[PDB]
Design a protein around this nucleic acid. Sequence first.
RNA 1: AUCGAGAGGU
Lengths: 1201, 51, 16, 45, 66, 206, 82, 116, 100, 72, 52
Amino acid sequence: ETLTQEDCWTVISSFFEETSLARQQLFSFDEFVQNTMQEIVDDDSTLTLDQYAQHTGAQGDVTRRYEINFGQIYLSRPTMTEADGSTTTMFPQEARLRNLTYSSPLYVDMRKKVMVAADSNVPIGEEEWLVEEEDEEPSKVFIGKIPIMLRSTFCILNGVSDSELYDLNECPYDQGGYFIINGSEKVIIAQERSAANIVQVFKKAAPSPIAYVAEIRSALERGSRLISSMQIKLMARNTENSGQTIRATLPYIRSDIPIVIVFRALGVVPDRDILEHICYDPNDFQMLEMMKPCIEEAFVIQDKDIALDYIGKRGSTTGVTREKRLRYAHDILQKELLPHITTMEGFETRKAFFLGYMIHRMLLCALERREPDDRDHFGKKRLDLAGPLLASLFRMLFRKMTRDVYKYMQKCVETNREFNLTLAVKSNIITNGLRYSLATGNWGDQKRSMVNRVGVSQVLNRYTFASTLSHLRRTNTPIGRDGKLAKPRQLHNTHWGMVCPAETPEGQACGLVKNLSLMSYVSVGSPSAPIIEFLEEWGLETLEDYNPSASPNATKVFVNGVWLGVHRDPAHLTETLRSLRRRLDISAEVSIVRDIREKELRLFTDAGRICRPLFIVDNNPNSERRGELCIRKEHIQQLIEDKDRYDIDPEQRFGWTALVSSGLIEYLDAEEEETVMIAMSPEDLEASRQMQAGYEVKEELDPAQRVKPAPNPHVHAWTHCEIHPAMILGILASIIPFPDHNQSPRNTYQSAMGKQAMGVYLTNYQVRMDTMANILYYPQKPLATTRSMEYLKFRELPAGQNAIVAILCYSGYNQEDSIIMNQASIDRGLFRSIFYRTYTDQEKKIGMTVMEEFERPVRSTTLRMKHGTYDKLEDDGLIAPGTRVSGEDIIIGKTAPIPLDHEELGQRTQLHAKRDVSTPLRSTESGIVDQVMVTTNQEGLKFVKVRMRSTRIPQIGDKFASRHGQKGTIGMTYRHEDMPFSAQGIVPDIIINPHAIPSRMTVAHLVECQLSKVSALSGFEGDATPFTDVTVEAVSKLLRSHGFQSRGFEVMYHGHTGRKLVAQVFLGPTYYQRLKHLVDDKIHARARGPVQILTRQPVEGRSRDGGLRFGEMERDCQISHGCSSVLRERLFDCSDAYRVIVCDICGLIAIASYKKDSYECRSCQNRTRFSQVYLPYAAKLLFQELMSMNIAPRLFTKNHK
Amino acid sequence: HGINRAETGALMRCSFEETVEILMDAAASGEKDDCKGISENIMLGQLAPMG
Amino acid sequence: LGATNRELINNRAANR
Amino acid sequence: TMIYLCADCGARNTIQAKEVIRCRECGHRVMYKMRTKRMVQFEAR
Amino acid sequence: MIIPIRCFSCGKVIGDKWDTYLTLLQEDNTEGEALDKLGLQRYCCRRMILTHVDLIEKLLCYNPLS
Amino acid sequence: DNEIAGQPQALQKSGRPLKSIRARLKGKEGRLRGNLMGKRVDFSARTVITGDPNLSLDELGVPRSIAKTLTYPETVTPYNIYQLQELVRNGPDEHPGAKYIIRDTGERIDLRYHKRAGDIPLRYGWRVERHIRDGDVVIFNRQPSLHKMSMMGHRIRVMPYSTFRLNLSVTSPYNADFDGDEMNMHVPQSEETRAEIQEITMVPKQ
Amino acid sequence: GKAVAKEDRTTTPYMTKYERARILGTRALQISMNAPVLVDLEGETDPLQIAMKELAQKKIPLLVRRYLPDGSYEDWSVAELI
Amino acid sequence: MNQPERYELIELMGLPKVTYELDSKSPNAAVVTLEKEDHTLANMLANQLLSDERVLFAGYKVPHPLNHNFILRVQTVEDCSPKQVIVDAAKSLITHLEEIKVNFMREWELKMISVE
Amino acid sequence: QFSPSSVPLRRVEEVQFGILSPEEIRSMSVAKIEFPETMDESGQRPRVGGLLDPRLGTIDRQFKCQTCGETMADCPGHFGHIELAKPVFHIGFLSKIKKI
Amino acid sequence: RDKAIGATVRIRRGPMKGLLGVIKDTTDANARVELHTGNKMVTIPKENLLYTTKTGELISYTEFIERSRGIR
Amino acid sequence: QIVEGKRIPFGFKYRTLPHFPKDDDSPESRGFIENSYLRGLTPQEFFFHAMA
RNA sequence: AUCGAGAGGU
């Protein structure tokens, strides 16, 4: 009656049956579209304009009020309207092919209203509005187009079966979770931020004048979701002042207000009240002693009105009357102070209570009673997914659209023109803004590009199925990528189960870019009202009636960072809340953290909290199953039975949700993990349980197995248990076999290199015209596989091959991380691949005249024709599929008319009227035209895409890698006869050097080879899942059972001499990957060619025939060598040699005519004394740039002593 | 702070972290450069007088 | 929604 | 003149000079060119 | 894609055994037993039947026609 | 100077700060660090490196394609006129051959586009840009160039395949290995530079 | 700049490695431009090898003008240098 | 792109199949260069030569795997020549292979008759 | 190599930094720049006196600079001048001006 | 302007006999030819190439010149 | 396993992972891997080694 | 072409 690992994997299988790997993106977007858009519309629902009566002296002057109310929003399915005006439903593949944004139009119900003031003599603002005119029904008005995330509930592919996906040219394996903007796929990278409504106390480092700072980043639940931030700074002890003063930094205040003054502005004038707010214990004298100096500092202000005046004088406005200053101070104190607590009248008591709480926390850290906060604790951070981000963007864009509508109202009213609702809205605002933000990633308005966030949207990575899965689950921390702050980059303890420990890029973004674990769930947010209602009805004492003195031992209750009140029995409250969540009466995303030392009960329901699921251990006092998992074997058998059953209703099967709603699985975030005790496996629970039942928990232990620490006797109750430790890994770390037998940076290196492995990325790559694609001819699934691969679908779309690898020193061509590849194996298709590239062109147009034509250009009329071949183009200016092209051969023929007024030296004969703008093939590439797609673009102009294919056979210089960070290039290829063989005639496909193994300590590579050999011999698949009881001893026994040396060695013979090698070789199958780094993609040589126009130096880039940079370090190396002429050649004769004539009198470049051999300096009237200077063109450019700043850099060739 | 304080040629120092400021100072003081260093000769494309 | 999506996909020729 | 294939039908469409790219049994606005008439030879190594 | 004609290492023709391999599997034969019945003794020749993934069938589902 | 403190920047019509003269002269990419103390150079190849146990310590194995691209401008004299004539006869496409002939007046004959390239008698004082051949001297380096020993002289061996092949014991001064490293090759274009590379910079001397 | 007398010369009497590289390069460059060769040729075609064999016989007609830091200089014949 | 054509492993392109030169450094020593040949011929030829008493030295090398050829250095006693010992070893190997062939064919015929 | 010149080739031994005087700027200039335009009404040629004055240098491979008559590969580019309405501070020199 | 450039050709004699290609460039002696297979690119003497005509025939080099001259 | 020169830090409150109790200074809690690469790391050891 | 952003390589 103990849970097994097979049962754990059945539970995980159910999880992934009901959960997609793109679930976070999809659910966030669904939340944004279904709910957040309506809330954003409502928050700015009404627009009102009051036309007062100007005193023009004409009888008939009456004030008017015009009102526009924005109603419900309607989102249709994505559609396209053509040039001819026909409107059709649009499908993702057509959008990808024709470069169309896959967006759905949005309509909003607007209603208009006009009212007349009852009397015009009333003071402004007191006019009574009588209903004059009103729209009987609303007008459904198109306001914009929202890009639709693929596979979301509003996509055309939602609820669509596999067969219909094929009919649409869609891969059933594709998970969606992205957008199509102008044909390109864009994924929104989750953005990490610090949580709002949390008080964080930070110790400022010396010699900063501030000792400690308590900061809260207050955000309204839905009212723009984050505006105000406050600080409470304690100032450092000074030799002049015997005490430290507490000053509150508030929005829109130029100075730090002493805390007592802001308390008085809140009505807590008496000192006793203030120190009861701050120091809840009268008997504690250190707190009051530290508060005394600020009371001393703030005695000059003893009343609320004087405190408000003090605040107002320090507002951003100077030279204002006292009444306005007091009004402004009260307005700031009400609205811009702690808006998450409240923003409405009569709530100064709660804000004062929370301010006292913040001061108490900061002084607890200043007394060194509690440690400061950890800025990097994962439970204090939130992930903004597509939902929240698109919500902020749409709020901004809808505000801009409403401003436009209001300006339209004002302009129409001024001119007495009739107001039309349809003409009022500039629908281009929302459409263009969303399109621009999703396309460029620059997050915000086009006009605030520098201040906007960047890189929020990235082109989806279609190199391998696993790389795409990884890209859909990527988080970015917007820390400075140049500043060297190792702490944010480090792997925190709280990352356990939330972020992948291994998968993180190497380089500047190491540790900042993170990847969600397999079972990590990111909350989308839920209402806090039901939870507050349950708290109120269960005995929550409101904060208005709370008196700390009466109940100092009672526990503060927070919800979303709002101190709602105080409870007297927080244990029972917490058990009741947890029970409710365990029935889903409360949302499963709700964090219920009881902090016993701090006497707090924090509830969280907001979005962005990363959670992970865990088993629940039965802890009920009267239960007969103390210390045993709630989930029985019966529940597992139910999962197996309902997995296959399809006759059952799809929504009424027993699966993952049935476990959560039944109280057998619980989602915990990092905040709640701090209050739980988690067993690492059911066997650990059991061992602890016998240890606690008096049994010795002792037995004969397989010496080959991992050694675990003995069960801790100090642990008597476990609250949870992990479903499987292997779930702490990401997409790519879950493809590594035996990752727990490797040195961790090798796991990171494999996680990075698995993205670049060649395979089949989508099944529909044939019908997709991608810019770049690399496809493996004969992909094979690994012989050694992890159980997590079933959910990553690596067996379905693998990205490598099982090569027979021998670890041997054979001819010395595999040294320094090179490999030797069998040439016969290459000839038979090993690691062969296809490279597809796509060239896009289209017809342009300006005004009413088309200035481009897809045609076969003719030498006799087209000016400036390229040097490539125009003979492979067909009559329609294009190139047919199946033809062979190379280098600069033209694949698309396009011409542009020239203005009739242009006269280019007569080179443009009377026949020459056009100019060639054709598209040549890349100079460094050649192949066969695979495909030529022809269509029309959004503007009804012709639009062509030419896909070329080119087979790449492995050769010397091509990167290959194992799944263990073992990367190399091919150094040499030997044929079948020349390679070492076994007594069966097995010849390895690859030979790798032994020296790669010891230093790197990639023992997982050797264990993989042995296990793959066993599985190839026996046919059973090899389980390489981490943290299993699969030992090398068991694999050795299995291998010996097949008539092989147990450790994987084989007697091999020399191919050259047939002699039996003195050493026995480690030979067996290992999964290798062809990497996107091919030598021919990189080989580059330049003799001469293009130069930059400005500097006249070799251009940059292999693709554009550019030179290589001779940098500062190379110059230093040649200096230390002493090779003066080498430097002169590299930096002058080979880059930008140039000649000028300087005047020997003034030292400035002269006017030189070499044709006439006449030189002149008008300034000096010099025509005889000149010098010839050889210098870099960049030097002459620098000198001219200086002369443009009135600096005269003068070159004198003779010592002017 | 230390390298640019040295009384070396103007071009040699402007090649290090204070380019326009150093050039402006040299212009303001009417400064003269001997072209006896490495950076100056390399910039002017002449055979460096060293090695 | 699934049925509507199926209807829209299958008749894309007729609805065009 | 030039014949293209309806990306849905695969039906041969004889588009002419400056005509909307559309399928006449399938309304599809994406079509493909046809395999060239040139000789295609590949060595089997 | 489709099963390779010959093995990568041994050069043995395996392209005429994929159908036989699948048929053997349908008859309640383990993959090891089926490979034994196919006379694939070298594990290099066995790995390619064992680890082959048939993407040709999935690529044939995107037929422009029905 | 558009980076003045306390002033509004002169923005672009595309919402970008203007490129002031100070910005052109300033920075790593400025004139004095991106165009004067460092440059893009002609007659340089780059590619992946593999190992060759059969190469001499001072030899660099160069791909045929790179050898065909890069050329050395050898001056025609009574001592080489015959071999230079043979190289001109071979043409730019047959290695070892030649690509250009530079006359006394400076005019540049392109042997590919000259209809009768092979039938051109050579005259003393001309130059022939002949393919770099086995035994030619080149500078070879890897980045970052942390010390003198990261740019060393090598003798060419033009050979098949697309990688730079070099002796194993030379990896250490370059800090190079064959897991994907790419290295650069610079071809000296004068007798003086050749003498310097051969007499100071060569691998055995290092 | 004042030329130092042959007897007063204080610099090293050996050819420096930099001097050797510069001398060989300069002589090879001059030979490539048809400078008369001052040594018997056994069929050598590379100007650098011709300059090397001229050096071995001390037949390079070149001087080294070694400059002292103050500006005074010493002229050393390639033949007399060791 | 820089691949060599595989037919270059079998085509001489005008090179001589066998080159024979006298090693001047040593007496009665010769170097035989065989183009488009590899360890198949060289190994057996050198082993057969070393079965011979008149052969003081017999070794072979393949200077580079990217060139298909091999060098064979043979030194004999003063009373014989390297060329004669090489030819005698080659003739002996031809005869040996001929018995291998004949006996294989006879045994194969016997075994097949046994099958029937 | 470059086109032949009778002026002897010399090494630069002195970079004398200074400030261009107003008279130096006026005299060393070849065209007074007054018009903000680059192109002209006719369009076939830039504006004479604008910001692409042919006397100010050639950037078209077609034509030869009027100032020197040389191709785009031998014309270094000449300097114009703008007569300011009233003097303005040189931002690079502001601190030195203040100190003086 | 050579008339051979752009003409489909097969290799008559040599190790690469029987391979199809298109003459990208042509010197007086040899033609630089773009083979259809393996992205290969070769230089082959004009005399070593059969030329493909409009009717599918293969003709010799001298036949090609005699056809191009147009004398009849 | 050593992070910033010290044993694995208490990133939770007085524990390194939610699998140990508070104030556990034992070798296993703070990042001592008694296993070898051959034998395999336990999940806690795997995480600590990943941190290093 | 220019500019900006991003993904990568050693």
